[PDB]
Amino acid sequence: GEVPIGDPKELNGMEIAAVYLQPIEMEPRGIDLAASLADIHLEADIHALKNNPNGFPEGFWMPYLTIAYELKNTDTGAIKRGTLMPMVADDGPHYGANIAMEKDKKGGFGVGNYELTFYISNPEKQGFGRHVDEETGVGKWFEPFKVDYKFKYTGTPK
Amino acid sequence: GEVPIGDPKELNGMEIAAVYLQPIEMEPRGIDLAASLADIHLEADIHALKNNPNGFPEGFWMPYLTIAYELKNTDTGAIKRGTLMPMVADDGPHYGANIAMEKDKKGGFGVGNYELTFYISNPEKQGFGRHVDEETGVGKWFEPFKVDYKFKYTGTPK
Ligand SMILES: [Zn+2]
Ligand SMILES: [Zn+2]
């Protein structure tokens, strides 16, 4: 199951949605938390809107983004942070991370009320280039920004 | 104002076409050869085919590839190698490099018959993941490969 986290935002020429899923078995091994040690996969779905000012066609996945996350259980105060990594599934690329929830004994990450924040930086931080000549050039990149979501976490999708 | 280089190749779930155009100005600075030192901008246009085996939607740009090129003037025997870098223009993302031809201080890269080779490695080299679970997983990435083109360079179009 895919559970939507809050409502998707249209910001800075992109549609930015958050969902969580069952833990994802991913390769290459070692880069991310193993699926068996996780309770969910947190995903950011980020695609260009129409009239994207940085030259991305409508619907294209936005690549080379840096996406940090903060996940807060507002009931318990438990907080965890990390970064999502780029990967591909049978239905296309996304940003994601396996996350231990109930499995994490270092904090109160069980069923409850959560706040999720993404801190998103533009592709130039990873060295992705942009044409700036008059003939082929595009608009300047957005400055780093945050999007916030509130959701109820009800357990690993079933 | 793109000049086609040879015939496009379809392999490993991708269409791989090459074009050149006038030199472009890229940010961030100090990575790509400066436009004034160049004669052309070489581009690799790489998009998913139908039924891409790694889950990329048809038409999507293929991101996180490592791509080198070798360019050989078959008339003079002059050969140069470099890297293509990911970037976005007003027509979307591509891999490209500004290249000195007539302006190459070594000489031998003027108007003539050329062989161009791309050497391409998969996204895992750059930390890109893939789902491997039964429900949403995708197959292995291609091993490093090359594709070859033949074309006539008719001079700097700047
Ligand atoms: Zn994933
Ligand atoms: Zn370019």
What single-letter amino acid sits at B3?
Answer: V
Measured between CB atoms, which of A31, A54, A86 is closest to B64?
A86
- Pair of tokens at residue B134: 């039964």
Domain ranges of chain B: 1-158
Resolution in Å, one decimal, please.
1.6
Rg (CA), chain B: 16
How far is A119 from A83, CA to CA, in rounded Å?
9
Residue for token digits 């801190």? A119
Q: How far is the C-alpha of A62 from the C-alpha of A60, rounded, in Å?
A: 6
Q: Which of B111, B95, B109 is nearest to B45 (CA)?
A: B95
* Backbone CA torsion sign across B2, A131, A87, A46: negative
Question: Tell me, what amino acid is at B126?
Answer: Q
In contact, B63 and A85? CB cutoff 8 Å: no
Residue in chain A lying closest to B133 (CA): A25
What part of B 54-93 touches A (C-beta under 8 Å)? 54-57, 60-61, 63-64, 85-93
In angstroms and rounded to an integer, the radius of gyration of the C-alpha atoms of chain A is 16
Place of tokens 């949605």: A17
Q: Is A29 exposed, middle or buried (0-12, 13-18, 19+ CB in 10 A)?
A: exposed
The method recorded for this entry reads: X-ray
Which CATH code is given to the segment(s) B1-158? 2.60.40.2480
- SS3 at position A125: helix
